[PDB]
Structure 1
Amino acid sequence: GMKNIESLFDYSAGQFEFIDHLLTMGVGVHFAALIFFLVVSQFVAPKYRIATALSCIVMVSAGLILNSQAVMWTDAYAYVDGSYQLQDLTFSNGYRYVNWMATIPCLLLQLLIVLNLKGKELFSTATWLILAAWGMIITGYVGQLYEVDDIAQLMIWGAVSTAFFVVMNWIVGTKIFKNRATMLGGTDSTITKVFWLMMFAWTLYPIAYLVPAFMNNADGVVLRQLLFTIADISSKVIYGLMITYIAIQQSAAAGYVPAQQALG
């Protein structure tokens, strides 16, 4: 009947509460980061301010999905005979997958803007990145419909998804290393750190996807929710702070005075 292994298990109070703690914190980090991005946007020059606005998109969108998951978790289970047990609703991770259709494009576009791509190059790269990402996400969603039924199918759609991932990482990595030299304000160093952050954070997702294949039980479910939390904070919030920092440094270097003031 069920699609996700979250819905197959009972949880101890400690497991159940840990997962609620993680989901609850995630919601407020995302909404808190939103206010911060709005306040510091005034120090970014207009030619880069879209990059900061794109972080605001991702914060609200991801914040509200987390908020839904956190409510669903407490609604789907009840404490009964010394364990939390499913009750009349089911819990799923598919909320995240569908949401990536909107947020992964935003994360990718904000990188292209601070790399200073422009015009045809900007629009071409953007298109290919967005199709590769939709490719990755849709095939991943279908795959994770088999996580209780058919691990074979999980792995096969996994592999296809991973093909798109690799193409997308290749485009990104190329544009970064080609454009690093033209970065302003000493941000060549910073953008390299961003590339590593992305390689680490983004790879947590396919690991979470494979948990059913290597840790099918309530401890795996705990692991998977922890991986998703770290990956959401790393890939969206911390990445966003680094993109905004790069935007401010380059704004100042280009002579925008609010940015120069913000830096002293």
Structure 2
Amino acid sequence: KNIESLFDYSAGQFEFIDHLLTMGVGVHFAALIFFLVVSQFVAPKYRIATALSCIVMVSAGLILNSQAVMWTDAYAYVDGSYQLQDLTFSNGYRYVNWMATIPCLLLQLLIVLNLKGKELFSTATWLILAAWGMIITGYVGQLYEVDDIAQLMIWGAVSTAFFVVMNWIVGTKIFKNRATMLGGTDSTITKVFWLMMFAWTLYPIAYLVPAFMNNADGVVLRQLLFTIADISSKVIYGLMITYIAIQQSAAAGYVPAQQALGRI
């Protein structure tokens, strides 16, 4: 069902994909240690936002690790190239994991936006429903990336509709609650919005790779786009969320935050 199964891979193509996934594991678990240590400098009001980054680091890191082992399990060097064996490789597990990681990325944004109570519960509910609609329709579409490209594009259009509506909720909440943010993070949160628009858009681009580059080099390109998008949407994004959480904690008088920012 996946275009990965259609091709043999040169030693260079196979080893580069292996190193891309392995490097992605190292980056996420290295960042995990950072968010863990820094969490003690976050005020209790925002500490959930930094803990969610730790949850995203292990969740994304485990999928990248699972993809890397599946990649080496599925292919062996036979007659001068890496060829498919018994076990299969698939990108579908990324979609299943997004069902958990995307709500975590959205929740930590709502936390540093100083949303509370019923507006927090209502906004998160609509964001998660829009995200799940996007992921499920996209998962169904990529099942047809070999057998029915036309069906992959129609499911992608439905998924893009959820994507655009989700981004409109995110943008509306950011620019409406930007005024409530402390320590100059009202400026920083606008860059987080544009980082999200850039990084999250890489995923539909990779989703369309079977339509404009259905060959072994397109397989490499898709994993490369996934690596750029994962690092930007989770690691860099989490580093900006954590900075915003620390800066607002210090502005609100949290002494550990003031001492942490003061020592650097």
TM-score range, shorter chain: over 0.9
2-structure distance, mates of 1:72, 1:30 = 19
**1:68-98 CA-partner distances (Å, limit 9, x unpaired):** 1000111100111111111111110001000
2-structure distance, mates of 1:222, 1:64 = 20
Q: What is the Cα-based RMSD across aligned positions, in Å?
A: 0.6
Unaligned runs of 5+ in 2: none
2-structure distance, mates of 1:140, 1:224 = 15
* Secondary structure, counterpart of 2:179 in structure 1: coil
What does residue 60 of structure 2 align with? 62
1-structure distance, mates of 2:92, 2:30 = 24
**1:200-225 CA-partner distances (Å, limit 9, x unpaired):** 00000000000001000001000000
After TM superposition, where is structure 1 displaced by more than 4 Å over at least 4 residues in a row?
none
1-structure distance, mates of 2:251, 2:88 = 52
TM-score (norm 1): 0.98
Residue 157 of structure 1, CA deviation: 0.5
What does residue 143 of structure 2 align with? 145
Residue 120 of structure 1, CA deviation: 1.0
2-structure distance, mates of 1:230, 1:223 = 11
Q: 1:77 aligns with which of 58, 75, 78?
A: 75
2-structure distance, mates of 1:128, 1:189 = 26
Q: 2:98 aligns with which of 97, 100, 103?
A: 100
* Secondary structure, counterpart of 2:45 in structure 1: helix
2-structure distance, mates of 1:199, 1:216 = 26
**1:105-157 CA-partner distances (Å, limit 9, x unpaired):** 00000000000011111110000000001000000000000000000100110
What does residue 122 of structure 1 align with? 120
Residue 99 of structure 1, CA deviation: 0.3
Residue 179 of structure 1, CA deviation: 1.1
1-structure distance, mates of 2:110, 2:88 = 39
* Secondary structure, counterpart of 1:84 in structure 2: strand
Residue 263 of structure 1, CA deviation: 1.1
Report how many residues are paired: 262
Residue 193 of structure 1, CA deviation: 0.8
Residue 238 of structure 1, CA deviation: 0.7
What does residue 52 of structure 1 align with? 50
1-structure distance, mates of 2:108, 2:78 = 47
* Secondary structure, counterpart of 2:208 in structure 1: helix
Q: Percent identity?
A: 100
TM-score (norm 2): 0.98
